[PDB]
Scaffold this active site. Sequence first.
Site, PDB file in Angstrom:
ATOM      1  N   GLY A 158       3.817  55.422 -64.855  1.00 28.93           N
ATOM      2  CA  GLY A 158       2.473  55.466 -65.443  1.00 28.93           C
ATOM      3  C   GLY A 158       1.478  54.661 -64.623  1.00 28.93           C
ATOM      4  O   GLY A 158       0.318  54.952 -64.689  1.00 28.93           O
ATOM      5  N   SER A 159       1.934  53.688 -63.840  1.00 32.69           N
ATOM      6  CA  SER A 159       1.050  52.852 -62.994  1.00 32.69           C
ATOM      7  C   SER A 159       0.837  53.499 -61.620  1.00 32.69           C
ATOM      8  O   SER A 159       0.200  52.837 -60.779  1.00 32.69           O
ATOM      9  CB  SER A 159       1.603  51.468 -62.898  1.00 32.69           C
ATOM     10  OG  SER A 159       1.507  50.829 -64.153  1.00 32.69           O
ATOM     11  N   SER A 209       0.600  47.057 -62.664  1.00 30.63           N
ATOM     12  CA  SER A 209       1.775  46.791 -63.523  1.00 30.63           C
ATOM     13  C   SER A 209       1.341  46.233 -64.870  1.00 30.63           C
ATOM     14  O   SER A 209       0.894  45.053 -64.919  1.00 30.63           O
ATOM     15  CB  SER A 209       2.748  45.881 -62.808  1.00 30.63           C
ATOM     16  OG  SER A 209       3.928  45.701 -63.573  1.00 30.63           O
ATOM     17  N   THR A 211       3.248  45.174 -67.382  1.00 30.37           N
ATOM     18  CA  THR A 211       4.073  43.965 -67.630  1.00 30.37           C
ATOM     19  C   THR A 211       3.943  42.947 -66.491  1.00 30.37           C
ATOM     20  O   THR A 211       4.090  41.724 -66.759  1.00 30.37           O
ATOM     21  CB  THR A 211       5.537  44.356 -67.828  1.00 30.37           C
ATOM     22  OG1 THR A 211       5.930  45.048 -66.643  1.00 30.37           O
ATOM     23  CG2 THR A 211       5.745  45.222 -69.054  1.00 30.37           C
ATOM     24  N   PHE A 212       3.719  43.424 -65.265  1.00 27.29           N
ATOM     25  CA  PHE A 212       3.799  42.625 -64.015  1.00 27.29           C
ATOM     26  C   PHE A 212       5.233  42.077 -63.840  1.00 27.29           C
ATOM     27  O   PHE A 212       5.388  41.020 -63.192  1.00 27.29           O
ATOM     28  CB  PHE A 212       2.723  41.537 -63.991  1.00 27.29           C
ATOM     29  CG  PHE A 212       2.053  41.432 -62.649  1.00 27.29           C
ATOM     30  CD1 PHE A 212       1.074  42.335 -62.280  1.00 27.29           C
ATOM     31  CD2 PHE A 212       2.448  40.499 -61.710  1.00 27.29           C
ATOM     32  CE1 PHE A 212       0.471  42.283 -61.030  1.00 27.29           C
ATOM     33  CE2 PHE A 212       1.851  40.448 -60.455  1.00 27.29           C
ATOM     34  CZ  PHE A 212       0.874  41.355 -60.111  1.00 27.29           C
ATOM     35  N   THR A 213       6.258  42.797 -64.333  1.00 25.12           N
ATOM     36  CA  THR A 213       7.681  42.414 -64.127  1.00 25.12           C
ATOM     37  C   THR A 213       8.490  43.545 -63.504  1.00 25.12           C
ATOM     38  O   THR A 213       9.600  43.257 -63.103  1.00 25.12           O
ATOM     39  CB  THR A 213       8.379  41.974 -65.424  1.00 25.12           C
ATOM     40  OG1 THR A 213       8.433  43.096 -66.309  1.00 25.12           O
ATOM     41  CG2 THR A 213       7.680  40.802 -66.082  1.00 25.12           C
ATOM     42  N   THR A 214       8.007  44.787 -63.483  1.00 27.25           N
ATOM     43  CA  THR A 214       8.798  45.938 -62.971  1.00 27.25           C
ATOM     44  C   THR A 214       9.319  45.631 -61.558  1.00 27.25           C
ATOM     45  O   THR A 214       8.508  45.338 -60.636  1.00 27.25           O
ATOM     46  CB  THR A 214       7.976  47.230 -62.964  1.00 27.25           C
ATOM     47  OG1 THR A 214       7.511  47.408 -64.294  1.00 27.25           O
ATOM     48  CG2 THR A 214       8.756  48.451 -62.531  1.00 27.25           C
ATOM     49  N   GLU A 216      10.577  47.456 -59.021  1.00 25.67           N
ATOM     50  CA  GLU A 216      10.067  48.260 -57.885  1.00 25.67           C
ATOM     51  C   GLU A 216       8.711  47.688 -57.449  1.00 25.67           C
ATOM     52  O   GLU A 216       8.522  47.452 -56.240  1.00 25.67           O
ATOM     53  CB  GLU A 216       9.948  49.735 -58.253  1.00 25.67           C
ATOM     54  CG  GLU A 216      11.280  50.417 -58.407  1.00 25.67           C
ATOM     55  CD  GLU A 216      11.748  50.589 -59.837  1.00 25.67           C
ATOM     56  OE1 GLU A 216      12.360  51.672 -60.141  1.00 25.67           O
ATOM     57  OE2 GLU A 216      11.508  49.645 -60.627  1.00 25.67           O
ATOM     58  N   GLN A 353       5.935  64.074 -66.328  1.00 25.08           N
ATOM     59  CA  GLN A 353       6.060  62.726 -66.925  1.00 25.08           C
ATOM     60  C   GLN A 353       5.420  62.683 -68.312  1.00 25.08           C
ATOM     61  O   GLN A 353       6.091  62.239 -69.253  1.00 25.08           O
ATOM     62  CB  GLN A 353       5.445  61.640 -66.037  1.00 25.08           C
ATOM     63  CG  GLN A 353       5.404  60.330 -66.801  1.00 25.08           C
ATOM     64  CD  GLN A 353       5.015  59.128 -65.992  1.00 25.08           C
ATOM     65  OE1 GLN A 353       4.533  59.253 -64.861  1.00 25.08           O
ATOM     66  NE2 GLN A 353       5.249  57.959 -66.597  1.00 25.08           N
ATOM     67  N   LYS A 518      14.974  50.049 -66.797  1.00 25.61           N
ATOM     68  CA  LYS A 518      14.482  48.816 -66.132  1.00 25.61           C
ATOM     69  C   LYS A 518      15.476  47.661 -66.275  1.00 25.61           C
ATOM     70  O   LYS A 518      15.179  46.575 -65.730  1.00 25.61           O
ATOM     71  CB  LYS A 518      13.142  48.394 -66.726  1.00 25.61           C
ATOM     72  CG  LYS A 518      12.009  49.328 -66.369  1.00 25.61           C
ATOM     73  CD  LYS A 518      10.790  49.050 -67.175  1.00 25.61           C
ATOM     74  CE  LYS A 518       9.550  49.404 -66.396  1.00 25.61           C
ATOM     75  NZ  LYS A 518       8.355  49.346 -67.260  1.00 25.61           N
TER      76      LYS A 518
HETATM   77  O1  LIG Z   1       5.858  55.429 -68.619  1.00 25.58           O
HETATM   78  C1  LIG Z   1       6.142  54.209 -68.465  1.00 25.58           C
HETATM   79  O2  LIG Z   1       5.984  53.368 -69.396  1.00 25.58           O
HETATM   80  C2  LIG Z   1       6.676  53.758 -67.135  1.00 25.58           C
HETATM   81  O3  LIG Z   1       6.512  54.810 -66.173  1.00 25.58           O
HETATM   82  C3  LIG Z   1       5.909  52.515 -66.698  1.00 25.58           C
HETATM   83  O4  LIG Z   1       4.521  52.900 -66.548  1.00 25.58           O
HETATM   84  C4  LIG Z   1       6.490  51.944 -65.431  1.00 25.58           C
HETATM   85  O5  LIG Z   1       7.793  51.496 -65.730  1.00 25.58           O
HETATM   86  C5  LIG Z   1       5.714  50.762 -64.898  1.00 25.58           C
HETATM   87  O6  LIG Z   1       5.616  49.739 -65.886  1.00 25.58           O
HETATM   88  P1  LIG Z   1       4.564  48.582 -65.582  1.00 25.58           P
HETATM   89  O7  LIG Z   1       3.137  49.203 -65.543  1.00 25.58           O
HETATM   90  O8  LIG Z   1       4.798  47.564 -66.732  1.00 25.58           O
HETATM   91  O9  LIG Z   1       4.965  48.063 -64.214  1.00 25.58           O
END
Ligand SMILES: O=C(O)[C@@H](O)[C@H](O)[C@H](O)COP(=O)(O)O
Lengths: 556, 556
Positions: A158-159, A209, A211-214, A216, A353, A518
């Site tokens: 999503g980011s 991000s 969460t700023f923890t992912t 990747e 997605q 994750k």
């Molecule tokens: O659909 C989702 O929730 C995931 O694709 C997240 O967007 C992805 O894991 C990245 O998470 P974050 O924005 O906390 O890094």
Amino acid sequence: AALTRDPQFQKLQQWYREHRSELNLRRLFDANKDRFNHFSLTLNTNHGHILVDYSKNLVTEDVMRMLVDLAKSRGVEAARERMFNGEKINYTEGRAVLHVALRNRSNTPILVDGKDVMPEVNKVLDKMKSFCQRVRSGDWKGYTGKTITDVINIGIGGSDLGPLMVTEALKPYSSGGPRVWYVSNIDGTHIAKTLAQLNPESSLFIIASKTFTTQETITNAETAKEWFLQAAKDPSAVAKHFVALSTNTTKVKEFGIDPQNMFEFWDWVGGRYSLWSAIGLSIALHVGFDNFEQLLSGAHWMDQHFRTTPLEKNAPVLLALLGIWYINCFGCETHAMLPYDQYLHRFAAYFQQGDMESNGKYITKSGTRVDHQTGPIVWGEPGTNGQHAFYQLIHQGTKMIPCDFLIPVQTQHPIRKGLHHKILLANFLAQTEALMRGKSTEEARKELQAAGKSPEDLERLLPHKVFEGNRPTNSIVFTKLTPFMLGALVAMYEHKIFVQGIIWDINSFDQWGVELGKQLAKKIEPELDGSAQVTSHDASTNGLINFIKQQREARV
Amino acid sequence: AALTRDPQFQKLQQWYREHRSELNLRRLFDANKDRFNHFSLTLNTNHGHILVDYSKNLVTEDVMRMLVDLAKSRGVEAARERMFNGEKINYTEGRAVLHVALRNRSNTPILVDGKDVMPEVNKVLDKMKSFCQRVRSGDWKGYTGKTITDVINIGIGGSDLGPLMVTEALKPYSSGGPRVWYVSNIDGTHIAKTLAQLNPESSLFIIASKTFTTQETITNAETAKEWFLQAAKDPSAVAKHFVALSTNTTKVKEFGIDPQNMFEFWDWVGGRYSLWSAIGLSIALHVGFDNFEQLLSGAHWMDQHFRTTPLEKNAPVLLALLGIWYINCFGCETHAMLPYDQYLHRFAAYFQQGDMESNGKYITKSGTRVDHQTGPIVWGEPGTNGQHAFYQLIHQGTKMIPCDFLIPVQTQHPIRKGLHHKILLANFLAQTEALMRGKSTEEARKELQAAGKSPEDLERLLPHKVFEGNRPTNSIVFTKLTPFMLGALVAMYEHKIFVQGIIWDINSFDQWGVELGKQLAKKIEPELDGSAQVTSHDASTNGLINFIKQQREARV
Ligand SMILES: O=C(O)[C@@H](O)[C@H](O)[C@H](O)COP(=O)(O)O
Ligand SMILES: O=C(O)[C@@H](O)[C@H](O)[C@H](O)COP(=O)(O)O
């Protein structure tokens, strides 16, 4: 599960059992020369028209009436009002669902726990607009005083995909914008081949991000910062080349970004609904904040259409209900999204997605297991290419695949006096007509005779050239793919996904399979270090690890 | 149809109905310490190992044995020999199927119409090698005496996606090669946005078309030739900047390409099997003819593996039979291909064409309608991105989706001392383990208890965080994605597709839906000229055309 117990659903299934064989498209069109008028919507947004032509679907007036009655029985309108009123309809995580607030151009108050979110939404939009003006103008300078030429989004899921799909779709609106790059994969190829093309002095990194923890994204961000600091040396220079799109100032500061460089969003912004938030900063940098506002304005227009239109003329509701008909009565596993537009080459991947992560669920709101199908597999590639490839299976395979065909009337590149766009349009039209009509034994025989084929050769080849047809399509035709119209089209599919979720009684807004993902790798990552064979997992996991350790220093 | 009549198929279906409940992966691995050793192949190509781990499939000894007996009963080996001996197994078109001849590095004679094809194959390969040396070295000059910096492939479907997928996959091997571009879509965006980035003095155009009549390709080629001639103003200059890859010398000359600039291929080279031919010229130009030869060699190794290996340890045959098991007993509509490799980002799209266009069929060899499923819908995106998106549906949806996970042990970019690739490998392993194992109510309750959730939060979350698992995967792990290993992997799937086609008794090598598609637009093209209302088709086709005529000069 609520759906199978619903009386309108049972009435739909009973009708399907008795009358399924009456659903022949060729026959329905021959008996009703007004079928297009009865089964199509035209929306005037005041910035372009949208024709949603659903007449090539295996439906009659009675089927559409029963489908609309199902949506009423399942409480679609009450669920819609809960979403727009800021109620916590993400019930597993206890969150509001307010992507509609992000593009609420009217600024009508939207209350979470009795507090209007719109002041905070608009404050972040002001901060994005000011930053975009400075970067695009050259006011914002890198650590050696140069203007930013390159913007690199680092984020996944999503980011990543929303900003990637939109900047691809609106590439013609990017003149005078920096180049935009998307780094998502942990695969070190992605950041490595991106960084190989960049100058640290003129590169701005956007760490996207929630969460700023992912793993990747944080790993990619550390690699980019190591690369940057190898040139700049001074840790002070990072504040000129890294910004963050996040909910967490502490993690952002801990990584080494000044919290003044954090563009905030909120728990009620789902990742796969986040491009309308601060997550959209790479869009606004690429095509300008004015075009980003136009994108939000089109989504807002379609939010109003969704909210005020009676169900039976409501574009996202009808797309949703046709989907329910094909999933829960016909049993189709998949839905194909086929935009006849090279700029929309990532549009199907984006809704792969948005759809599958939303409605790929099996537990209802009451915590009960479904006893019916939920979300389909969404896939597709732009036309006309698919016509040379997988359309073979759509036309002559053994699978029923509902297809959405999408096209702009007006091209961004009307080259050769519109010759290319005319051919593109003719193919768009001719393919849905052929999927509907097919071609009988007799039509194929007469064409083979006219081709000059010998009597056996003809009766050899004939059955292979017969098309059964009756393959249903939606055609979605829109004036032009502008920022506003793209906004409307994305929001239309968001609300289609929302309606299907309410009917299935699942939570479209959590993702416990993605949250599990994750945390899966952490158990295996430390076991990959060293030569020692692994025995702590099942035989396959162990075998694969031991093969990796064996092949790790093979020379090829 | 042949398959439903087959006694081994009936025995397989019988077993499924009765023992389906035996097929619990957690239980199969707990009972059999040797399940990985018994249900995996390790192939040593002498240029890397391939581990095909099929042990996380819903199979036992008895199932695999009954599947191999089906392959024998359906005559897989006799059909394989007919393909390799140049017999006309494309029986609807009356053609040989000899992609295997294109990479026949052994040069063993293969006769078509009693003549060896290998002299002609090797003549074009020598011509390609000679041209690639001249272009890449800078000997071959543009019309102002500059070296070629940019190569543009113009072609669609089989004349596009193979070379595109391979040049993306082998991007690290293109140091000192020209940049390569793929123009395919009729959509004028594609050629227009490409030409805007090119210098006509240093751009070489490749017109890739088996027939040299395809409307998209010929229209795009004319547009490029017009753009070129506006700069060069010299018809003679065309011979320095345009080559053709085709089977039709007449149409190539008529288009104005010097017949010396034509790289030939043959009727028996299927479009979706053509990257091994002259169609591969853009590959050889990008990564060098030496790397292209390594790619052909890898395919040749896999061809020999396919030909000489007993069925029960034959990699393409076992992959094919696992597919039949899921398609024709479990009724799975789809097959996901999930390469954990950013360079393979077009690999699933390539086999989406290769698989679906081959086996998207419903008419058997005897010209009878099948009464069983044939080819699946193939789809996917590279890992790890999918884990953040559609894997939600793979883990917790209502669909069964057989997945092939693929990964190289060795990365092309071992950045951060291999930290990225270690995380990628850990994710690849953890995902297939979690699909197999899932997570029970008891396990989920223990994790929420340990996380310190209130009884209220625990009981609300608990049922949503349960994973039923038992989701089958293949793990395909290979030493390194080199040109040789890429050729071996692509050929392995080519032969999987062949084996499934023989078991279904369909023609994997015609495409009457793709041939139909090339004839459809001509009847609608003339109706779009002028602003008269159209009434000559069905109501929907008419409705869409009239909306297009209304909106085509609306101002937005
Ligand atoms: O659909 C989702 O929730 C995931 O694709 C997240 O967007 C992805 O894991 C990245 O998470 P974050 O924005 O906390 O890094
Ligand atoms: O699979 C096919 O046959 C098609 O995808 C063709 O490759 C495509 O139609 C191009 O045809 P040609 O190479 O004849 O231009």
